[PDB]
Structure 1
Amino acid sequence: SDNAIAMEAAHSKSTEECLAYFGVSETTGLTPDQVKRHLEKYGHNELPAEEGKSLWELVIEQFEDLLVRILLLAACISFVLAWFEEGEETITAFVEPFVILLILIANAIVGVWQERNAENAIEALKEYEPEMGKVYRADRKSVQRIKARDIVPGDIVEVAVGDKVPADIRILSIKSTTLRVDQSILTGESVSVIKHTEPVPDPRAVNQDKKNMLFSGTNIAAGKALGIVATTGVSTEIGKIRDQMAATEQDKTPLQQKLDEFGEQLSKVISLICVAVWLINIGHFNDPVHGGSWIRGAIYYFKIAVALAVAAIPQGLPAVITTCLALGTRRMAKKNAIVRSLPSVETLGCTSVICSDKTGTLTTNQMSVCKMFIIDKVDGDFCSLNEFSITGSTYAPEGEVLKNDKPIRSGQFDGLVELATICALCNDSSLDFNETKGVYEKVGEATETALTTLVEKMNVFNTEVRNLSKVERANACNSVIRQLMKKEFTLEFSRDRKSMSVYCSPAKSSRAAVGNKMFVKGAPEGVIDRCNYVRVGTTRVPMTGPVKEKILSVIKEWGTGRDTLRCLALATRDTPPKREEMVLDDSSRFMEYETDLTFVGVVGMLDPPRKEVMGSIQLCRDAGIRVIMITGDNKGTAIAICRRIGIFGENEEVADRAYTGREFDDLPLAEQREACRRACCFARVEPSHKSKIVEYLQSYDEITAMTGDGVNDAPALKKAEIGIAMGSGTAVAKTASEMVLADDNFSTIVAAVEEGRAIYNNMKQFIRYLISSNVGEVVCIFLTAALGLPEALIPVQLLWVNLVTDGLPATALGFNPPDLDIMDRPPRSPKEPLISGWLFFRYMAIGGYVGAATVGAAAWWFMYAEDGPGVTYHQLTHFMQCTEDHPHFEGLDCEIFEAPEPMTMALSVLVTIEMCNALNSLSENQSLMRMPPWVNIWLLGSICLSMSLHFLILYVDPLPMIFKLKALDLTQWLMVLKISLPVIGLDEILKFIARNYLEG
């Protein structure tokens, strides 16, 4: 982007001037060529980088280098203070600080990388949830949603309530009665501000004075408007205020709490073992009080404590957790489950209740009129209707009307003529043929578009359509009907009457003798009471009780039937008041205007459930996860749908498991709480009922997933453990949620729960693996110090094992395939400890065997080895007396006790045991005989890499001279194998005990 300013003083220009400056028609929008040129000139609508990645690594490197240099200077001060009179052994005090320096450098490197890895994992979340916007462009007549970064200056953009403003926008037209905007992120204003479209004359006016502009980042609090993009990217008012840092996420995840508890307890245990080593050596309490005995006897305990600290901490664990979470997040996003916060992953597996909206999530929101009836014959008490069916489930105008499964012509019935007239006039929506996809798409609400499609199918006025193109066919019959009745105005919907109407005057064309007419479309509950008459074809009879009961009976049948239809009543005021009589500024009077109606007919439209919903409901059943439907349908239809998708049984009694908002409010408080623990169906629900349901569900210590999309959903989404916003819904709901459904599908919720379970299981696996490895290392150190043996392992090798040798297999355990019963077990408790009970004893045995095996191989080299000396046990424990008391240990050089061969034996045994235990860590209970090792190929590859690196630091000459190791032969490797492989048998015995005797 070269020109970084775009249009200046857009608030000062008028709408005409702003459209003229970019040369765009407001009707069509930008042409593809205009979009290409503007994108090339002004660049994408986005801000560069994160916060400052080009100068961030240097900061952390220099900060940790300062933290290293200060410890170096402190240790130097200590060693220099140990020079005044302490001059006994200055040779041994020369090796310890070198190792400590290496430890500090290594821990600094990993502490930098793990932090950067976590930051990159957090930042990768944003790539999965790209901000979207709605534009009108010349290639399509309907509004199309695109990525906000693809919006360019001059674009015509549409914003509605709950949307996030994608660019700095000059308001062109306010479609709603008022436009209120929340500008708290910019001006810091509290209450929403009112916008207009008049120009603001002051060129240097403040943002609060720019009452005709929409600033990027702000949110539409109320209304709907159209505008033209003035500036994008950095030129945006919010792009100038790039200096803004919100508070961190905080709120420690339960896993982090358990890990920190482990850290504190491990500090205590390190202190306990450091004291226990002194407890073993009681003879040190018989030494003289003066001299240099206590000093040199305390230096040894200030070193073994450091070695034990290296052996005890799983240094590489946080990187493995971060990588597992990042890759699982990418997997979930590949499966349409867009996680907005890493903690939510852990929570996803604990989900005990899923509260889902019906329309759009459990169903496809692809509405279609499939049944309709009008009045046939009325004889006092007898009432007969003309029922019909309609084929075609999409919005395409393809299908026909069927009477008793036989096609008829809709124009024969005057009732159906009026039916179609009402459906065409009480309709703000239309159809647009997408020639690229080659399909018909909706322009407006699914309901009104289904009405439009029905009018196209019916063709009550008999119009030629076989010679029309796909574009001319979409809105042909509706245009025909519009040519006759001229819509004077529209009485908008209102809750108090549950209907809408249009005042229409007939055009002066052989139909002016009809007079003005009001056409009413609404819910039967609201419309039928206001009908005094009933249209019979072209005549009219008075509306009575029996007719009303017949209408209601058929509506009930369709609502509770196999199709679970939502019916719409259609009526018309034949003798409406005059335009001068009616006032339109207050909807409270509209119900009065829509009185003395004539009932014409009823349309039954279906919103089919998604074909995967039943199976996902079953999966939640097997997983012990309750599913509660929340719908706008009536209670009867709601229960019928619950039986259709499997929430309820086809024959079970549900008088206490299905409620309406009013019924739920009529119950006392204790009964409300008690009803939430059993209800699975809520119909006709107020926005506060979601929050109340979440609170009641929390009162039973349940982890609730609650779906939403609108602004009134935001509080509940905030209270719920897993707020789930729809991908097509508002931005306000998305910002208040833990997960977004890219496809708005309930099955995606189920898949997210399953994936969270699997990911937490694999995390448990590699956590227990690494920590049992650390247990084994600590046991090795303590067993060596207790028996007074030489150091079988040095802390450098321990760092290499914890960071490199074991880091690869743990990351690979992150990719373990999920168990076949992952969704046939109850939800995990969030307070579930990772290692306790039988697992404590199991991994304690494992770690004890690890330490015993390492130290025992180190001891085997000194004794029963051809390459090793003929040293016995009584002198190997007294090896420090070799240089002095030589006749007691006469034989070879004393330096043979500082040999690299026993350390190499111990390290090889540790590495082999850790590969074997990684193989054992593929499952918690299943033995290797049942689940083969070749199921997780990444584990095999990681073990190959670990062994290749081991052979590298053993044989490739420059490296074993650094690791203080010596290459081995076939006999020593065979000993390593013989003393390492039985760990598989040990864990196999423990698994057999857990399976065949510890299931309860």
Structure 2
Amino acid sequence: MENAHTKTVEEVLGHFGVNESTGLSLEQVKKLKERWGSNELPAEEGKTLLELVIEQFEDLLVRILLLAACISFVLAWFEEGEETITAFVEPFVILLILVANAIVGVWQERNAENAIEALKEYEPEMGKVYRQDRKSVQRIKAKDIVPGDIVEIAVGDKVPADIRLTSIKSTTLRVDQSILTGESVSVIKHTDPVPDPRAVNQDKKNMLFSGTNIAAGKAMGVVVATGVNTEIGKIRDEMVATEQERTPLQQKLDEFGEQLSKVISLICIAVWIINIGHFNDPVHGGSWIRGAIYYFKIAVALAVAAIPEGLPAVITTCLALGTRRMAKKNAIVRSLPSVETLGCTSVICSDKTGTLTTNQMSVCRMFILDRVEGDTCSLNEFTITGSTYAPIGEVHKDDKPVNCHQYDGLVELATICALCNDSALDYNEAKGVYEKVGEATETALTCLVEKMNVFDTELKGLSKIERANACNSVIKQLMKKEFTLEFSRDRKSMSVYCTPNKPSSMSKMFVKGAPEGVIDRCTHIRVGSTKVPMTSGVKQKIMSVIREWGSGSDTLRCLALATHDNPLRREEMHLEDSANFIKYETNLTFVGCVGMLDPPRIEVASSVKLCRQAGIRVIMITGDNKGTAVAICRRIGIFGQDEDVTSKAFTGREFDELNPSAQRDACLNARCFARVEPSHKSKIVEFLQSFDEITAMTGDGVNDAPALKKAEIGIAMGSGTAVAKTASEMVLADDNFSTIVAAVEEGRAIYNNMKQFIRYLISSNVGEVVCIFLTAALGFPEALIPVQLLWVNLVTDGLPATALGFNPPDLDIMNKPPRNPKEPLISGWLFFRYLAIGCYVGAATVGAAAWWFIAADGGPRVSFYQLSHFLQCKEDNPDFEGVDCAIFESPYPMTMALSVLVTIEMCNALNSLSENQSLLRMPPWENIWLVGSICLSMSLHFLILYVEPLPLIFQITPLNVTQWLMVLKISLPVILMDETLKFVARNYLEGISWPFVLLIMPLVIWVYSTDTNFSDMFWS
């Protein structure tokens, strides 16, 4: 089929030799699968490995380090290619950390993509077809569809293949094809040929394209192209990327990064400025421009050292780790930055039917009006056994088997429940169970019709497949369904126009819908076979029985059934818009009600209890009745079993007719919303966000799709509508509601890891800056040269910093209220902690650089005055004898300072496994990646210190054991300093590991054996 849209439906059906009624035979299916193959696209690469690594170098910090690497390379061109290891070692160590972070990030997001694409096949996508093996619609796999078979598309579903539309069962068909044509509006479809052979996909208004979703209406058509021949498979390699919302944590991190860049630039300009004086010294080469290049080099090396270039990499690794941890729990997260939103979510709105309930409905109770005598009235209540879709239940009047032809109202009730249905029952033989084809409510009605068997159809020799829609077919062979006024949620009703087979005008309309809405339009009553005028006492008792059902121990979901006995002809009805449909479902005749059970999921009542423990408020947004909604809320735990819900449960009409005072008190106090349309479902989320709250909407159906896009994160169920899965950002593949608590904990842990990374890097780099500024202030010789600054950068800001993204979650992470998004990223107490640790680190490195000069046994015994005035050290100066300038440029104090800096930052990295939990409670081996990274950094330091040609490159010397002892004596107290800060933060602001104490305590007692203090510290 080359041009399906330009051909009559008769021609497209005759090309394959198919009837829309029966469908494709089994031999035809075999031949067409031999000739066309499976209806599936090959698994192609999500992102190229070159694209994945290039997208790592897009941040501002990575780019400015690339610029600094290019500068250091160009600035090292005082010779035209004569050195390879003594000159170009600075750009190499600047690029090595960038390469390491890029490798880690690429590996993590590759693992996340692999996990996501492996979870994509958790459930095989299905499709409803008509084939000659059965006489009813059947669910096959979406890959088993060959070009030629009939497929009904059944609003809410994803189109499984390119389908030439044949007949539209509803009054209109709206399709959502934004994924293909780009238009963000529902397109109306017809079944007439378009004459243009080269028509674009926007003008193919008689075709359905694979991958698109049905927004409204039911239809069926013949498949014309499957697999790669589809319009979405021919452009599966060409797509346009769309970022979703730029999550509020991302904006915080971006503005923090740019503020940090400004602060670092200011600090570096200050470093270059405070050294303007000694540019003309002969140490630099006896020229002003010679000294300016050296201190500009120090400035750029301090920029590279102080900038947290590993921030984007650790962000992506945290996001990918969260995505993989969620995919292990059968949760498909679409975008990575959306794994964090549930960590700051304060309100979780949830659809009732299909999301909080198992969506396995079954009609448990029903009644018909027995007699009505003016003021008095008597019902006829029945109960039906069976809680699954298997049509093997029984009907009991008073716990006694109902006779064959006692009640005449049951015949009409079955006729209404059978003819006003768009669903069906399908017998899956692979699992040997009956499943729904369509909606759970209509399938429950179908199973009820099968259980009743009002015409006494013999069900002896019928197979498990023929018994699914036997009585339904028996009923449908009696009347001819002319058309269907489809179900609209503003009317909350659905009507079907029926006429007899032989043309003898005896047409009727069968209406089914919400109980109160249908009864408010009922002006008569069907007592047996008599139509009596509807009174007020009967209208009161029917609503009383419906309320008793909804509020009972079963918490039934009720519908009302009516018949319009004298409807208008088709030529007198105007079915252009749905708003007019309610104009024809008037003057009805009440027949009965059916109450169906839909049990809540067993993982809800617990997870709700956890959300309230984490400070999250769970709201129910449902279109069902208020009684049954409040009953389900009490069952799952939103309301107490005897709690007053006067001002905590509302309907759409009640919430609309409220003063802004009460209308703002509701959203902060109400926990249940019933009888709300999709528009109101989205309006509730809009209000909750207007009150500055992070809202998470969970849903399953089409009415949830407008709200799933309004919330900060939408959660769709795996067995839910495809429209709801498109409108959402996380899909629970196994429909496990307790996975939302796991996602909340994962987002909170992601935020905690980001904060610990920020803490470690800021508190270490501010110390790296304080060391330089303190050596410049006291007048001491420069402790570090640019290559040593770049070395401490590569050692400390590298893998030990990215390994904080693998931190374990705190134990009290889900016992705290959610984080306020208006709060600053860094608190004031946190800034105090950063500055305290950094001041200690800087003072420690400056003291280790000054310990070797003043109070070292191997080094000299110079005094503080002679050290701070080392520029005046001359053999002519009377207060300088016994020492010379050759000892003030010694590489021993530079080595001491560098090793103390590396060791104190490796020790501070251990203070960053938790914000307030001590090392005795969370030992370092809880994060084995951090221990490994610290070991590797110390190994690299010891490598450059002792391997033969390395120390001359970094201008250092091998240190003995007596100096490493001082390095550890100075480096360790940062651990107890942060322990003191954590102790202050735990008690005054908001089970220890014995294997850890008995392991580090002997080390503490062995390091401290003597005491060596400096001499006559005047300035500091």
1:124, distance to aligned residue in structure 2 (A): 7.2
Residues 153 and 232, structure 1, Cα contact 8 Å, conserved in 2: no
1:469, distance to aligned residue in structure 2 (A): 3.6
Return 340-349 or 12-21, whichever deviates more.
Answer: 12-21
- Whether 1:503 and 2:487 are equivalent positions in the alignment is no
- Whether 1:256 and 2:251 are equivalent positions in the alignment is no
Return 647-656 or 237-246, whichever deviates more.
Answer: 237-246
| Unaligned segments of structure 1, at least 5 residues | 1-6, 84-90
Return 377-386 or 232-241, whichever deviates more.
Answer: 232-241
Residues 169 and 483, structure 2, Cα contact 8 Å, conserved in 1: no
Q: In structure 2, do the counterparts of structure 1 residues 298 and 645 end up closer, same or farther at CA, with 3 Å as the change threshold?
A: same
1:556, distance to aligned residue in structure 2 (A): 1.7
- Name the SS for the 1:705 alignment partner: strand
- Whether 1:992 and 2:962 are equivalent positions in the alignment is no
Amino acid at match of 2:842: G
Which residue number corresponds to residue 943 of structure 1?
934
1:986, distance to aligned residue in structure 2 (A): 1.2
Which residue number corresponds to residue 479 of structure 2?
486
Amino acid at match of 1:910: L
1:353, distance to aligned residue in structure 2 (A): 1.9
Which residue number corresponds to residue 1001 of structure 2?
none
- Name the SS for the 1:998 alignment partner: coil
For 1:693 and 1:497, locate their aligned partners in 2 and report how far apart those are by CA, in whole Å. Answer: 19
Amino acid at match of 1:135: G
Of the three residues 358, 367, 371, the one matched with 1:373 is 367
Q: For residues 866-916 of structure 1, what are the alpha-carbon distances to aligned partners after superposition, in whole Å with 9 as ceiling and x for unaligned?
A: 665666656555666779779987779976666655544444433333333
- Whether 1:523 and 2:517 are equivalent positions in the alignment is no
Amino acid at match of 1:982: P
Which residue number corresponds to residue 328 of structure 2?
334
Amino acid at match of 2:931: L
Which residue number corresponds to residue 1002 of structure 2?
none
Which residue number corresponds to residue 692 of structure 2?
701
- Whether 1:445 and 2:443 are equivalent positions in the alignment is no
For 1:229 and 1:884, locate their aligned partners in 2 and report how far apart those are by CA, in whole Å. Answer: 99
For 2:570 and 2:722, locate their aligned partners in 1 and report how far apart those are by CA, in whole Å. Answer: 42
Which residue number corresponds to residue 270 of structure 1?
268
For 1:776 and 1:709, locate their aligned partners in 2 and report how far apart those are by CA, in whole Å. Answer: 53
Of the three residues 350, 355, 376, the one matched with 1:356 is 350
Alignment of 1:712-731 (within 5 A): 716-727=707-718
Return 343-352 or 880-889, whichever deviates more.
Answer: 880-889
Amino acid at match of 2:127: V
- Whether 1:230 and 2:225 are equivalent positions in the alignment is yes
Residues 678 and 703, structure 2, Cα contact 8 Å, conserved in 1: yes
- Name the SS for the 1:449 alignment partner: helix
For 1:326 and 1:668, locate their aligned partners in 2 and report how far apart those are by CA, in whole Å. Answer: 45
Alignment of 1:198-347 (within 5 A): 198-200=192-194, 203-205=197-199, 207=201, 210-215=204-209, 222-225=216-219, 226-230=221-225, 232-233=227-228, 236=231, 239=234, 245=240, 251=246, 253-276=251-274, 294-296=288-290, 298-347=292-341
Residues 361 and 745, structure 1, Cα contact 8 Å, conserved in 2: no
State TM-score, norm by structure 2: 0.81
Which residue number corresponds to residue 41 of structure 2?
45
For 1:9 and 1:655, locate their aligned partners in 2 and report how far apart those are by CA, in whole Å. Answer: 61
Residues 401 and 410, structure 1, Cα contact 8 Å, conserved in 2: no
Q: For residues 929-970 of structure 1, what are the alpha-carbon distances to aligned partners after superposition, in whole Å with 9 as ceiling and x for unaligned?
A: 233333333333433444444444445556556555555554
Residues 170 and 483, structure 2, Cα contact 8 Å, conserved in 1: no
1:658, distance to aligned residue in structure 2 (A): 2.6
For 2:832 and 2:56, locate their aligned partners in 1 and report how far apart those are by CA, in whole Å. Answer: 41
- Whether 1:680 and 2:680 are equivalent positions in the alignment is no
Residues 159 and 213, structure 2, Cα contact 8 Å, conserved in 1: yes
Q: In structure 2, do the counterparts of structure 1 residues 35 and 309 end up closer, same or farther at CA, with 3 Å as the change threshold?
A: farther
Q: In structure 2, do the counterparts of structure 1 residues 840 and 614 end up closer, same or farther at CA, with 3 Å as the change threshold?
A: same
| Unaligned segments of structure 2, at least 5 residues | 991-1020
Residues 279 and 290, structure 2, Cα contact 8 Å, conserved in 1: no
Residues 30 and 154, structure 1, Cα contact 8 Å, conserved in 2: no
Which residue number corresponds to residue 757 of structure 1?
748
Of the three residues 651, 654, 659, the one matched with 2:650 is 659
For 1:155 and 1:781, locate their aligned partners in 2 and report how far apart those are by CA, in whole Å. Answer: 77
1:328, distance to aligned residue in structure 2 (A): 1.0
1:15, distance to aligned residue in structure 2 (A): 4.5
- Whether 1:642 and 2:638 are equivalent positions in the alignment is no
1:630, distance to aligned residue in structure 2 (A): 1.3
Return 948-957 or 531-540, whichever deviates more.
Answer: 531-540
1:406, distance to aligned residue in structure 2 (A): 6.0
Which residue number corresponds to residue 3 of structure 1?
none
- Whether 1:827 and 2:822 are equivalent positions in the alignment is no
Return 551-560 or 187-196, whichever deviates more.
Answer: 187-196
Q: In structure 2, do the counterparts of structure 1 residues 694 and 210 end up closer, same or farther at CA, with 3 Å as the change threshold?
A: closer
State TM-score, norm by structure 1: 0.82
Residues 277 and 786, structure 1, Cα contact 8 Å, conserved in 2: no
Q: In structure 2, do the counterparts of structure 1 residues 296 and 366 end up closer, same or farther at CA, with 3 Å as the change threshold?
A: same
Q: In structure 2, do the counterparts of structure 1 residues 199 and 463 end up closer, same or farther at CA, with 3 Å as the change threshold?
A: closer
The number of residue pairs the alignment matches comes to 968
For 1:371 and 1:325, locate their aligned partners in 2 and report how far apart those are by CA, in whole Å. Answer: 49
Q: For residues 260-299 of structure 1, what are the alpha-carbon distances to aligned partners after superposition, in whole Å with 9 as ceiling and x for unaligned?
A: 2222123223333444456xx7xx69999xx966545544
- Name the SS for the 2:127 alignment partner: strand
Which residue number corresponds to residue 915 of structure 1?
906
Q: In structure 2, do the counterparts of structure 1 residues 801 and 152 end up closer, same or farther at CA, with 3 Å as the change threshold?
A: farther
Residues 109 and 320, structure 2, Cα contact 8 Å, conserved in 1: no
Which residue number corresponds to residue 423 of structure 1?
417
Which residue number corresponds to residue 622 of structure 1?
613
Amino acid at match of 1:423: C
Of the three residues 1, 11, 36, the one matched with 2:5 is 11
Return 331-340 or 44-53, whichever deviates more.
Answer: 44-53
Q: In structure 2, do the counterparts of structure 1 residues 639 and 603 end up closer, same or farther at CA, with 3 Å as the change threshold?
A: same
- Name the SS for the 1:365 alignment partner: coil
Residues 174 and 187, structure 2, Cα contact 8 Å, conserved in 1: yes
Q: For residues 27-46 of structure 1, what are the alpha-carbon distances to aligned partners after superposition, in whole Å with 9 as ceiling and x for unaligned?
A: 55696856864665x89536
Amino acid at match of 1:254: K
Residues 234 and 240, structure 1, Cα contact 8 Å, conserved in 2: no
For 1:664 and 1:733, locate their aligned partners in 2 and report how far apart those are by CA, in whole Å. Answer: 25
Residues 489 and 504, structure 1, Cα contact 8 Å, conserved in 2: yes
For 1:496 and 1:61, locate their aligned partners in 2 and report how far apart those are by CA, in whole Å. Answer: 54
Which residue number corresponds to residue 849 of structure 1?
840
Residues 135 and 156, structure 1, Cα contact 8 Å, conserved in 2: no
Q: In structure 2, do the counterparts of structure 1 residues 791 and 465 end up closer, same or farther at CA, with 3 Å as the change threshold?
A: farther
- Name the SS for the 2:669 alignment partner: coil
Residues 531 and 543, structure 1, Cα contact 8 Å, conserved in 2: yes
Alignment of 1:139-218 (within 5 A): 142=137, 144=139, 158-159=152-153, 168-180=162-174, 194-200=188-194, 203-205=197-199, 207=201, 210-215=204-209
Amino acid at match of 2:495: M
1:588, distance to aligned residue in structure 2 (A): 8.3
Q: For residues 164-215 of structure 1, what are the alpha-carbon distances to aligned partners after superposition, in whole Å with 9 as ceiling and x for unaligned?
A: 6665543344344344556677677797655444445654455555443345
Amino acid at match of 1:696: F
